């Protein structure tokens, strides 16, 4: 606080700015396929390269799953798993994210203006495939589609002037918007993903171990907002 | 699949990805129309 107070008086001791800390704990997402050495030799497609690619794809999938709806029990706590509240930025606990609980396409605008003016510049929408289909399906009371231009243009690149993005692992009636560069810190270890073909322990088998120490937390809880549309 | 493994717990075997074969059998589709040589000879248009 900046106390103007009385000009002609001893100046009072103003309260200092508060600080919060976000404990983003890292946890290993690991894959341990016990491939048989037979297939490695006998395949003429380099089955291990394909297996590592599949493990990388599933690692991206599990990374999205954890960073979206990861409960927190030795996994990255996704921003949706973090507790929610309908209060404003000044009223909310720093731990909790702001959520809009309507019961039409009105709430989205509310959500965008739940953010501060500065977050809107680099704000991004995160929408599930089902929820994106719902938003495109949210019709004017006239009946024509309010988000998408029409059935001809296609998927619109912006929802409220902000680049929309599609996360597959979001809930069926939950949408979010925020400056995730501020709002969510994905944390990887300097080791990164560490693949090790264990073709020694059970010989005749090549156990591909591949783990990455992933973490995720809601930094700057004022930079992410959630919108729980009706369950229908 | 990928396990959300922890520190005390051991790393159990994850299920490997399955591969599916698509068997697109080539089958013949044929036409065997018996035209009379008469119609071939006698049609003003090239009937064949």
């Amino acid at each position: 606080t900046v106390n103007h107070g009385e000009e002609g008086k001893t100046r009072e001791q103003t309260s200092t700015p508060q600080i919060n800390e976000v404990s983003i704990k890292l946890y290993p997402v690991y894959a341990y396929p016990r491939t048989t050495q037979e297939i490695v030799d006998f395949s003429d497609v380099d089955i291990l390269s394909w297996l590592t690619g599949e493990i990388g794809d599933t690692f991206t999938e599990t990374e999205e799953s954890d960073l979206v709806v990861g409960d927190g029990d030795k996994k990255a706590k996704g921003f949706l798993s973090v507790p929610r509240a309908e209060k404003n930025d000044k009223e909310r606990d720093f731990g909790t994210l702001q959520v809009i609980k309507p019961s039409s396409a009105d709430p989205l605008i509310d959500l965008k203006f739940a953010l501060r003016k500065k977050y809107r510049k680099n704000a991004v929408w995160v929408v599930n495939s089902t929820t994106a289909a719902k938003l495109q399906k949210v019709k004017n009371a006239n009946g024509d589609y309010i988000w998408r231009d029409r059935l001809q243009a296609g998927d619109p690149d912006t929802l409220l002037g902000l680049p929309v993005e599609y996360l597959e692992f979001m809930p069926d009636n939950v949408i979010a918007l925020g400056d995730f560069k501020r709002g969510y810190y994905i944390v990887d270890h300097e080791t990164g993903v560490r693949t090790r073909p264990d073709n020694l322990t059970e010989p005749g088998f090549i156990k591909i171990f591949t783990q990455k120490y992933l973490g995720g937390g809601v930094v700057d809880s004022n930079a992410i907002k959630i919108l729980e549309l009706p369950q229908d | 699949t990928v396990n959300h493994g922890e520190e005390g717990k051991t790393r159990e075997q994850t299920s490997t990805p399955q591969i599916n074969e698509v068997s697109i059998k080539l089958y013949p589709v044929y036409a065997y129309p018996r035209t009379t040589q008469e119609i071939v000879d006698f049609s003003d248009v090239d009937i064949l």
Binding site: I39, V40, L51 | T16
Partner: peptide, 5 residues
């Protein structure tokens, strides 16, 4: 990956 098809 095993001998299973």
């Amino acid at each position: 990956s095993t001998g299973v098809p």
